[PDB]
Symmetry: D2
Subunit: 171 residues, 4 copies
């Protein structure tokens, strides 16, 4: 397991920001990959003062492919676009998103993820660290605990406490 603190997450986000500036790529539009790239997109936005954020509803059931459910954006024609996600695992998600954004004829599509898995089909133009361990983000920790309560995350006892009551009241 790799279980980044928010402090690490912040450093991941600073790194991306530093790389984007160093390489001269200041996006006009951030495309958040819902829902995991939600927090990364908002943090990068605030860091680099990027005021335009759009969103794509896509999920990779683990279905054989990622499935787009909704694309929340206005015209992207002639704009500098950065696709933001939290991790590139197989890389299917970043590929599918990049393929569909391109159809909006932007000036440029680049990709950022916080973390990379070694076996990714697609390597983000910008990332923080490549990890061969199982990553547990602060925003999917409970989904991971619901699938294995033996995962060593903090505040689990407060969570198990609430989840128990939750399980009772909606069956």
């Amino acid at each position: 397991y790799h279980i980044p603190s928010w402090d690490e997450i912040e450093d991941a986000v600073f790194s991306i920001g530093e790389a984007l500036v160093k390489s001269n790529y200041i996006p006009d539009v951030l495309i958040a990959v819902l829902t995991g790239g939600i927090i990364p997109a908002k943090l990068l936005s605030d860091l680099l003062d990027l005021k335009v954020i759009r969103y794509i509803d896509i999920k990779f059931y683990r279905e054989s492919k990622p499935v787009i459910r909704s694309v929340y954006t206005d015209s992207l024609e002639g704009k500098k676009v950065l696709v933001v996600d939290d991790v590139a695992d197989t890389g299917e998600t970043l590929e599918a998103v990049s393929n569909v954004i391109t159809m909006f004829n932007p000036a440029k599509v680049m990709t950022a993820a916080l973390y990379l898995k070694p076996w990714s089909k697609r390597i983000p133009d910008f990332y923080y660290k490549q990890i061969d361990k199982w990553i547990i983000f602060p925003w999917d920790k409970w989904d991971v605990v619901r699938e294995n309560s033996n995962v060593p995350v903090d505040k689990k006892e407060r969570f198990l406490n609430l989840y128990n009551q939750l399980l009772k009241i909606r069956k």
Copy 2:
């Protein structure tokens, strides 16, 4: 020139409807290709009692490719989809739309257009008549008149009358 009356347009729409029913394809979702496939989608909808219509904002500047500006839809997963447009010229537009809908993982994507140009790259699964003449639809007649007032359409004099005043008041 081919300048279909609404009566012809209605027959074009009945034909598509007849073909869809005869072939057993009753869509769950109509995707209107904005803005030319707008009236065709609404007429087919009413004809076949299809209550679910979604929309895609795409235009082919005549830019080298059609450009998607917006996709107005919720999940299409496992649904029977019909893409509706008014004409397939080069076929670029129907291809681009069909490519992006597929990413929503529907059950099936089929295409309908009212009219086909002989040189289309993509042939709609359903169409009314193939025309090698320049088609002037009832809903783009004035765009055509603004580009050549010598086109033999009806009510042109009423239109030239209004267009003249229009040209004055917004420069």
Copy 3:
């Protein structure tokens, strides 16, 4: 009884709206098509006045078997920022005016420069006259784009191409 405007009348309706818009010097930056009856009106007006920017709102007034509501229900809003823009809301008929009002309120929250409404037809009991309209009518209107919906719920209305429709409708009812 019923009003059944020809396509020729709808063109005249659209023309009249365009003529009134130019006469009032209100040329919209953005057309807001009220889905789905406002679809054809909005497209034709777009072509008439060379208005290239059309946006859409999915709103429905449920008045039928089982599913029935007292007010229109918005189901989706299809638009980018309307901020500082002259907006014209386009629909086919204002009946009670509940739909135009609902759409006007929701569009106002986008802070446009101005919101105006246009509907082709109007009923005497509409709770507000649209800023632009072709004809006030007191019959129930069957449009070219909802005729088969009316025939389905009322087989004996006098419409063109009925037998042709009935045959298609027959084959639709059986494929169940």
Copy 4:
């Protein structure tokens, strides 16, 4: 002065909201994230309570140089039908409450089964208490997700990693 909640406090805030939601037996069908400050709150609550359906509204209260408005402005609404659903509106702070109210009104027009509001923090002068909240505060709140926006407009606020930010910000100001 300023309130600057740690990430640890935001987790506790989210937890408190979740705990209150379960205690009230109000488990939302749909989360409505108020963009953009409500983004992180909505995602974390989604994970906490296993709520899989998140929708979004692009709304902004312009309170800055040149561009300034008296009320929030909606710029886009990102949702399918909310009809018959239990909806929870999630935001980071209710200040005047003008935003929560605007979002509540617009969501109501989708005819949900119910609309409830949650904001992590609350000011004593809010025109309405959200149905769910972590803490009433009277300082101006600097969140983890808008800290650099505050530093930019106010260089002398006491935030972590300031020098690192200033160096990046410096290189941003020059690439003009």
